[PDB]
Amino acid sequence: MDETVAEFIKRTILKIPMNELTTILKAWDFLSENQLQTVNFRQRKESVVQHLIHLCEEKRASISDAALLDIIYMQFHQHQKVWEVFQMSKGPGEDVDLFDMKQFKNSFKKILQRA
Amino acid sequence: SGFRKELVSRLLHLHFKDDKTKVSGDALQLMVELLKVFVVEAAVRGVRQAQAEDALRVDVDQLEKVLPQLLLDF
Amino acid sequence: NFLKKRLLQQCETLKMEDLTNVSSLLNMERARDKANEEGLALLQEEIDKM
Amino acid sequence: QQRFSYQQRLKAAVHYTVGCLCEEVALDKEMQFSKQTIAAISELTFRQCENFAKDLEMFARHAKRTTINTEDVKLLARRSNSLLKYITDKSEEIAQI
Amino acid sequence: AGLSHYVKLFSFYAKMPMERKALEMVEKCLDKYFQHLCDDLEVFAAHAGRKTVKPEDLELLMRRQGLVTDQVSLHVLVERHLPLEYRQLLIPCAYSGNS
Amino acid sequence: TPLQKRLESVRKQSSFILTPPRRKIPQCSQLQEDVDPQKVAFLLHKQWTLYSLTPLYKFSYSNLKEYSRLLNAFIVAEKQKNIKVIFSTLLGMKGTQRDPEAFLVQIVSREGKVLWTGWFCCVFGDSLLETVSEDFTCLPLFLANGAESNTAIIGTWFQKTFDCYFSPLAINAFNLSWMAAMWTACKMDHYVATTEFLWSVPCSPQSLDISFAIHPEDAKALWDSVHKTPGEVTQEEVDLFMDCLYSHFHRHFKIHLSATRLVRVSTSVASAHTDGKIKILCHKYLIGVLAYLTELAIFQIE
Amino acid sequence: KRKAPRGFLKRVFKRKKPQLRLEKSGDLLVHLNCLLFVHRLAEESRTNACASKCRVINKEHVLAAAKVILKKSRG
DNA sequence: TCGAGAATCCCGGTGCCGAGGCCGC
DNA sequence: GCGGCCTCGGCACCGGGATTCTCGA
């Protein structure tokens, strides 16, 4: 329900194949159990990619969760977009006693939006 | 004020494709009214799509996006 | 008449709405860029101050 | 020449009276009509006055008539509901005159 | 019926596959098209002062719809879309007995 | 003479009498006469999918407009089952003066978006000219590059109107190794691309492919190691170049590359695949690369 | 499709408005009006489809088509 | 000596035709 | 569960980003 967000959701919803439509749309949580019955997932591609995005127009979809849709799409399609492997290395000392997922999310977003 | 009589005679009669058709003052002042509300309606539609975009100015492009429904409607 | 031959004098010899509008948009963009340099450069001054 | 002196002089008259209308309708919604905005709305009034003249003549031709009466402009007011309602009361006010 | 005729003709007029859910809404579009037309023929025939709706009563209406012009008159518009045995009724042919 | 000459040619070819074609290193082919610089330069870095084209019956290089219309009206009709077809004689894609002038077939779509750009050329193909009658204008090579669907439509049109038949030219790994050797033997400068040999091992369950990409100057110095007779490259010299590749690959990875098959040999002169999508023409040696390609097309036709 | 229903248009013109005197072939003119109205619908809906680059006409393109053409086709 | 501009090696991010699925007879 | 229908997807050809390396502050 925004620029580069609604059509972004459209472009990531025609990406996902018809078989695993339920699997990815259930995990990203915007479509609750009641919302799944409204759209007939078995009918057509352009039908579902138009009714689902409307179901986010009423749900006022934001890029924060539109990107989560792309994440869940790739979690089942990780066998594309060839992956580099980065290897971190701490020096001498104790391990990371504080990898708080909240703190790591903060310490990553803050540093990335710093530059 | 309005779009006066000797001007409404002249403007309409310019687009008249023949010389023998006249429009009476009873209909002339109503023609004044209909194009006065042409200005009023085009202006209100433009400023309405302006609050729809929340502007303090009526720009060039607002009028261009209002013609597809202005000429269609009026 | 003189304005039509002014046409015939300039156009014969020889965007703008995009100019004005896009120039105002890009001026806001350069304000945003000055904000970007204020933020990035100052946070670089703090990072290299560290 | 004559076509230019005709339509440019009425373009001037349309701009002048439509600018009076611009000052008269700019005071309602506290708005200002820029120079190109007035220049545009004046030429749409001109261009669609061409449309009204095209319509109204064949409107009289439609009733096997040469003169233009109030039912012809009522058919010009037939186009839209909101100005049907607006022009109905303004037309009974016409008949008051 | 006839609305189903027009939605099927829509298929060969849009040259492109659509949805049935689109067709019952274009059915409401045709219903409102008549809801504007048959009272537009009403008011235009009343404008001419005639109880019936003569062919010129609709030529003016189609002038209103911008489809009749000084370039494209009424009869030429019949050439391009109506079949021959139907335009034989509308546009006057000539046998010294013009229809 | 009109047919029996071709029968004797078929006899000679099938005899297989001591074939090793000691080939002259592709000589720098200074662009002959017209050779429209814009057209030829557009025709170089395009991946031509080779075909073998039997001689065209009743063809003439005057009725190009009639064939253009006859094929344009056929292609858009295959869409009924926006497109312009421009037959264009190339005027210079010929080895000897007696060869038929190469001519193009371009599916031009509004603007000059050339969808297909066919290309029939007969350069240094005088093993076919002297065996076919005058009525046939023989162009053994056909060059696609457009989608396979449009090629399999213009080919049908050509079969219908000219009695010419398109076998998809498949360069076997032997001919592929040959051309991979004579292209690192050339006298070029400023090597555009590395000399890559895309091998493809014959494993039944899996389909591992190898890209033995050599530095183009390093392969030239490796070729000079196995190059002894100048002017002409022999089969033994080509095999020794290929075996120096083999003994630099089995040396490193202990897998016998000679037990695999070439599928693509990219070179600074011209890339060359096997399955048909073969000839990229990076440099302007294309009258020599096309000479080899036409000589190979004769092999398939004759 | 190569047809134009004589009966259906007359039945519609009588059902919707009970008081008219549509002429011998006036319903044929009504069919021409609807034919051209649906022409405009098809072409401007093709434009609507290219607006969102949808390769199938859907509800969201027809509803946008209606408010333009149906209003335009009003006399 | 060094800083911005252009070209081009390295690999995408795209275009587009066979394969698999799927709904009347 | 098949008949002419349709939709993903490997392969591959064409379009910008950063490294070369030449020139200006």
PDB file of C-alpha atoms (C1' of nucleotides) in Angstrom, chain A residues 17-18 44-45 77, chain I residues 6-10:
ATOM      1  CA  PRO A  17       5.190 -20.404  -7.376  1.00  0.00           C
ATOM      2  CA  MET A  18       1.583 -21.509  -7.040  1.00  0.00           C
ATOM      3  CA  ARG A  44      -5.102 -17.870 -11.159  1.00  0.00           C
ATOM      4  CA  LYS A  45      -1.780 -16.091 -10.759  1.00  0.00           C
ATOM      5  CA  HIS A  77      14.413 -20.448  -2.887  1.00  0.00           C
TER       6      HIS A  77
ATOM      7  C1'  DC I   6      -1.190 -23.154 -19.733  1.00  0.00           C
ATOM      8  C1'  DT I   7       2.938 -21.705 -16.509  1.00  0.00           C
ATOM      9  C1'  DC I   8       8.312 -21.937 -14.229  1.00  0.00           C
ATOM     10  C1'  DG I   9      12.716 -22.142 -15.335  1.00  0.00           C
ATOM     11  C1'  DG I  10      17.679 -23.587 -17.306  1.00  0.00           C
TER      12       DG I  10
END
